[PDB]
Amino acid sequence: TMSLGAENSVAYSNNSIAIPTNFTISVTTEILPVSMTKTSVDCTMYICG
């Protein structure tokens, strides 16, 4: 049976806050398709050779 991720009880209360004391600069790739190979077919030469 697949796991969805680790459980985490967030330490909530009506008067507690968490604030970051530091940071990391992250660089992450995203890849997107933009074009196909431009194909042409002569239907008469495909069908009738």
Partner: protein
Amino acid sequence: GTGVLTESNKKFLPFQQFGRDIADTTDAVRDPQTLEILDITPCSFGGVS
């Protein structure tokens, strides 16, 4: 058929008379008088713009 004939480096076995493409079209032949193997290339084609 119709095409351009040339010599070929295709290593035919002595029982094979011709070779075929993925399209089922014959693309090489043994000549029946002098037993050389010829490549068949289609006559050049394309769109006119």
